[PDB]
Design a protein around this ligand. Structure first.
Ligand SMILES: O=P(O)(O)OC[C@H]1O[C@H](O)[C@H](O)[C@@H](O)[C@@H]1O
Ligand SMILES: O=P(O)(O)OC[C@H]1O[C@H](O)[C@H](O)[C@@H](O)[C@@H]1O
Lengths: 562, 562
C-alpha cells in the first residue's frame, strides 16, 4: 500500500542524513568498536563495511525501515514459492534450482524440486556421455568445442562463471583441451568470432533461450545450424545441436531432438538462471558436473544464510540496505563493482543486468509512480585495471560508492626470487590501500606540511569521506563463485523489496522490440522489394535512407557465411 | 573567472525550463529541426536530433563556448602551448598523426620530425619482424606478441585491436599471428597471457610512459623470467622490446637500446594509442600500412576539429551536448552503445579517456568547482546491452546514449529465405532504440490497445529520453582512427567548457602512496615475521586475515603458473 517514502522510518533516515553529513570517515575509522560492529561473516566470506558513511545508529535506523517495509516476510514469501512477481503472476524461485534433493518448494501447488533435480541428473548423464567421447559427430569424431547461443540472462551469467572457473586449478584441469564460447550478439561479426578456428565435426551447439523466440538468439541459432549443414549435411543437426528452454514444443519445431532438450521454468528469471540448465548444462560439458555441483552448493549455502540469518549477521540484507542508504538517502546515482581478480573480469557485466534490469523501474509493484529514483547505475572493471582507468574520478570527481572484492588464496600464485612481494601480494596491496585512500583523503594542510607548492595543493587535495565496502573471500573456486553469485542475486532483491518495486519483471524492453520489428519490415521491403522508406520521422527516414543507399554485394536471396 | 557564474551559464540554466515544456515525440516531427541538428564529415554522420534540445539550445551553447573561449583553447592545444598548467606540459596527441612537413612546436622545437622518426623506426622493425627474418633464440621466427602495460598503455590499443581483428583487410594481414595484452598485476592475468604460448615463438613488448608503474614492471620481470627459464638469459635481447618516455630506465630493465621506441611527455596515457604505444604492437599484428590508415583517420578529424565552424564541428557539438546533458539537464551518466561486436572494447577505453580527464574537482586555476563535472561513462555493445541494462534506460534513471552504427558490415552473413540479413537484423535495433527512447508510449495508447488497467502503469514509457546516433560508412582502420579522434576531442571540449585540466591525473597518487605502505607491511610480515602495525582497526584485521594463510612454496623460491 503506502509508498515507502511516506513512512516515518523513511523520513527518519532523511533526518539522519544531516547528522552523518557532520561526520568524516578519517575520524570514524579510528573507532575500534564502530568498525568491528560494521562487519559480518559467513564461512569463507568476510564483509567489512566500516567505510560506509554510517554509524551503528544508521544501521539501526535502516533496520526499522526494513521492518516497516516487511523485508523478512517478502523474503520468506519468495522462498515459499508464492507468486510475488505479481505483474507476470509468477513464482520467483531461482533458489529452488540449487535446493537440496529433499527440499519441498511448491509452485502452483506442486513441489518443483524433483523436476529441478530431474534436469540436473539428465545433464549429468549427458555430460558424462559427452566428455567421455561416446557422443560423436557426423564424421565420427568426438565433440570438444561447445558454442552456447543465447543473450541476456542466457549469456552474462554463464559467461561470468566460466571466466571465474577458467583459471581455478581444479576446474581448469577438468576442462583440459575443451573450449566454451558464447555466441550472443546478432551482429554477424560475433558469429564469425564464435566459429573461428572451429570444426563443425568437433563442435557441439547449445541454444539457450527461455522463450526460443528471442530474435537475436533464433537467428544465431539458424545461422550456426546452417554452418553445420554446409559442412556436415542435413542430418548432422541432431548430433551437433541441443537446447535449453522453457518451451520444448518450439525446440522440437527448430529441428532438435526432444530428448536433447533441457528444460527450465518460467519462475526462473533470466538474470537469475545460471543455476538452472542455462548454466549447468554448458558448464558441465566444460568442467564436468562435479565442479558445477560445487558451484550450486555454494549458492545453496548463501540461500540458507539469507533466509535464516538475523539482519545484523545477514550479508545480503546488509549489502542491500547499505545500497539503499547510498542511493536513496545520500543520493549516489552510480555504484562501482571493483573486484581485485581478473578471474572476476566478467562479474561487473553480469551484475549490470542483474541490478539494472531488476531495479531500473519507475513505479511501485502496485503501479504507483515512484516519487524517487530506484535502481543504481552499475559499472566496473577488475582491479588493478580500473585503478588506472577511472579511479581518478572516484577520488576527486563524482562520489561513487564501491564494492571491493579481494581473495586471499590466489588461483595462480606467482613469485620471483628476490621480489619484495609475490605477484598476488602486489595485487592485494592496492585492495587494502584504495578503500582507506577513499576514506581518509589528504588535506591541504597535510599537503602544505609536505611543502607542496601552494598553486598545486588545490589540485592535490583529496576530500576523502568517500564510501566503500570490502569483501574478503577465502578462495575463488566453484563453491565460492556460487556464494558470490548468490550474494548479489539476494542483494538486488533486497533493494527491490525495500524500494517496494517488482525486481523480477522487465516491461521496459518491450517497446524497443516493437519498433525494431517495424524497422525490420521496412528493411525487408526495401532490400527485397525496392519499396521506399515510409512511416518514419524525418531523422529516422534519413538514417534509413543512408543505410539502404548501400546496396548489398551478394546475388539476390543467396546464402553467405564468413 | 568561473564558468558557472557567467550569464551564458545562467541563461542556459533557465533554458532548461523551456526544454522541459517540450517532448521529443513532438520535436521529432519537425523536419526543419531534425535536419539542422546533424553534422557530417567524410563517412561520419552525426544525428543528434534526439537530444532534448532545439537549434536555439545549440545557439545558446555556442555563446557559452564563446564566453569559455573554446576556440582559443583548441588553438593553443594545436599550437603546442603548455595548456596542461599543473604539470607544465604541452598537449599534442595531435602531433602523433601529423604529416612530416607539419610544424608543431613544444618549447620552440618542432616535434614532428621526432614523431615520424619513431614511426619510421617502427615500420622498419615491423617489416623485419613480420618477414620472419627476426628470429628467437632457437632461431624460430616470432609469431605471437604480448603487450605488457596498464591504463593508457593498454586500453586504447586493446580497443583498436578488437576493432581491426574482424576488419577483412586487417584480419588478412594478421593471419597466423596473436597479439595479447597482459595488464593486471593479478598473476591470473599472467597465466592467461602465456596460456598455450611458446617463449621460442613469442615476442614481448613492455609499454609504460614512466617505465616505473608497479604493476607493469612486475609483469615485465615476470615475463622475462618466463623467457630466460626456457631459452636462457641471452634470449632477452631477442624476445623483449620496450615503449616508454624514459629510455635510461629501459636500458636498466635490460633491453637492447635500439629496441626501445620513444614517445614524449606531451602524450597523455589516455591519448597515446597513436604513439608507439599503439603503433608498435599494432604494426606487428597488422603491418604498418594498416596502422598508417588508422593514423590518417585520426588526422582527418584533427583538421576537421581545428578548422570547421562550430555548427559543422562534430567534436565541438558532441562536447557541448554532453555538457548540456551533464550540467544543465542533470544527467550523471553517459552510455556508449556501439551496435558492433568489433567495437566491444570501445567503452572501456572511453571510460578512461573521459573519466580520468574530466573527473576533477577544481578548475584549472585551483578554484573549487560549485558543480560537478566529468560524467560516469559505461557501455556494452548492441544488441548485447539491449538485453542487459536498457530496462533501466527506458523506465528508470535517464541516461543519455551515444549510439554508433555502421553501414557496411565487416562480416556480412545472409541465409536464403530469411526476412533480413544478420547485419540488417542488428541495424533495425540500432534504428528503433533511439526513436523508442524519444517517443515513449503513453497510458492512453496502452488503454487503446486493451492492456488491462492494472498493467498500464508497469508498461508505460515516458519517452523524451535523449540519445544521439553516429552512422559510419564502414569500420576499417581509417574509420576506427576517426572514431578515436572524435572522442579524444569531445572530452577535451568538455574540459574546456568546464574550465578544468583534462590532462593531469593527481587523483591517482594517494592510492599509490598507501599501496606502497601496504606492500612494505606485507614484505615485513611475509619475509620478516613482523606484526601488523600502523593501520586503522578495520585494515589491521583485513591484513591479519590475509597473512594468516602462508604460501605453500619454499622461501624465496620462484614459481610460475598453470
Ligand atoms: O532466454 P531468452 O528466452 O532467450 O530471452 C533472452 C532474455 O535474456 C534476459 O532474460 C533479458 O531479461 C531479456 O532482455 C532477454 O530477452
Ligand atoms: O603509462 P604508464 O606509465 O604505465 O602509466 C599507467 C597510467 O595509466 C594511465 O595512463 C594513467 O595516466 C595513470 O592512472 C597511470 O599512471
Amino acid at each position: 500500500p503506502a509508498l515507502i517514502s511516506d513512512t516515518d522510518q523513511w523520513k527518519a533516515l532523511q533526518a539522519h542524513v544531516g547528522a552523518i553529513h557532520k561526520t568524516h570517515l578519517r575520524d570514524l575509522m579510528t573507532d575500534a568498536d564502530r568498525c568491528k560492529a560494521m562487519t559480518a561473516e559467513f564461512e569463507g566470506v568476510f564483509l567489512d563495511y566500516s567505510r560506509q558513511q554510517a554509524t551503528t545508529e544508521t544501521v539501526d535506523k535502516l533496520f526499522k525501515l526494513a521492518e516497516a517495509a516487511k523485508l523478512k516476510e517478502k523474503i520468506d514469501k519468495m522462498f515459499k514459492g508464492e507468486k510475488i512477481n505479481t505483474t507476470e503472476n509468477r513464482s520467483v524461485l531461482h533458489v529452488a534450482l540449487r535446493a537440496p534433493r529433499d527440499a519441498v518448494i511448491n509452485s502452483d501447488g506442486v513441489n518443483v524440486v524433483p523436476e529441478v533435480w530431474a534436469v540436473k541428473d539428465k545433464i549429468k548423464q549427458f555430460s558424462e556421455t559427452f566428455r567421455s567421447g561416446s557422443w560423436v559427430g557426423a564424421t565420427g569424431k568426438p565433440l570438444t568445442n561447445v558454442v552456447s547461443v543465447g543473450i541476456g540472462g542466457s549469456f552474462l551469467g554463464p559467461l561470468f562463471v566460466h571466466t571465474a572457473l577458467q583459471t581455478d586449478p581444479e576446474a581448469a584441469e577438468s576442462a583440459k583441451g575443451r573450449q566454451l564460447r558464447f555466441l550472443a550478439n546478432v551482429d554477424p561479426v560475433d558469429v564469425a568470432r564464435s566459429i573461428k578456428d572451429l570444426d563443425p565435426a568437433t563442435t557441439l551447439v547449445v541454444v539457450v533461450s527461455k522463450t526460443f523466440t528471442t530474435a537475436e538468439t533464433m537467428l544465431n541459432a539458424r545461422t550456426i545450424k546452417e554452418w553445420i549443414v554446409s559442412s556436415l549435411g542435413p542430418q548432422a543437426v541432431s548430433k551437433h545441436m541441443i537446447a535449453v528452454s522453457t518451451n520444448l514444443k518450439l525446440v522440437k519445431e527448430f529441428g532438435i531432438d526432444p530428448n536433447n532438450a533441457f528444460a527450465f521454468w518460467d519462475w526462473v528469471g533470466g538474470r537469475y538462471s545460471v543455476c538452472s540448465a542455462v548454466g549447468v548444462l554448458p558448464l558441465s560439458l566444460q568442467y564436468g558436473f562435479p565442479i558445477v555441483q560445487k558451484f550450486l552448493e555454494g549458492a545453496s549455502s548463501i540461500d540458507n544464510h539469507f533466509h535464516t540469518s538475523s539482519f545484523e549477521k545477514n550479508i545480503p540484507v546488509l549489502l542491500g540496505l547499505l545500497s539503499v542508504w547510498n542511493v536513496s538517502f545520500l543520493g549516489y546515482p552510480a555504484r562501482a563493482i571493483l573486484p581485485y581478480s581478473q578471474a572476476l573480469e566478467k562479474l561487473a557485466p553480469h551484475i549490470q543486468q542483474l541490478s539494472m534490469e531488476s531495479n531500473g523501474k519507475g513505479v511501485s509493484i502496485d503501479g504507483v509512480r515512484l516519487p524517487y529514483e530506484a535502481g543504481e547505475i552499475d559499472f566496473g572493471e577488475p582491479g588493478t585495471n580500473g585503478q588506472h582507468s577511472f579511479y581518478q574520478l572516484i577520488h576527486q570527481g563524482r562520489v561513487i560508492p564501491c564494492d571491493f572484492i579481494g581473495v586471499i588464496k590466489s588461483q595462480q600464485p606467482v613469485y620471483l626470487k628476490g621480489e619484495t612481494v609475490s605477484n598476488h601480494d602486489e595485487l592485494m596491496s592496492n585492495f587494502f590501500a584504495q578503500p582507506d585512500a577513499l576514506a581518509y583523503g589528504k588535506t591541504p594542510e597535510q599537503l602544505h606540511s609536505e611543502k607542496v607548492p601552494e598553486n598545486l595543493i588545490s589540485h592535490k587535495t583529496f576530500q576523502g569521506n568517500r564510501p566503500s565496502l570490502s569483501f574478503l573471500l577465502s578462495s575463488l573456486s566453484a563453491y565460492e563463485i556460487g556464494q558470490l553469485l548468490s550474494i548479489y542475486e539476494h542483494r538486488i532483491a533486497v533493494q527491490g523489496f525495500i524500494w517496494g518495486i517488482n525486481s523480477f519483471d522487465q516491461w521496459g524492453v518491450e517497446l524497443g522490440k516493437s519498433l525494431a520489428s517495424t524497422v525490420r519490415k521496412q528493411l525487408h521491403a526495401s532490400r527485397m522489394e525496392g519499396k521506399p522508406v515510409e512511416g518514419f520521422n524525418p531523422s529516422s527516414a534519413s538514417l534509413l535512407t543512408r543505410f539502404l543507399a548501400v546496396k548489398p554485394s551478394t546475388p539476390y536471396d543467396t546464402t553467405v557465411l564468413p
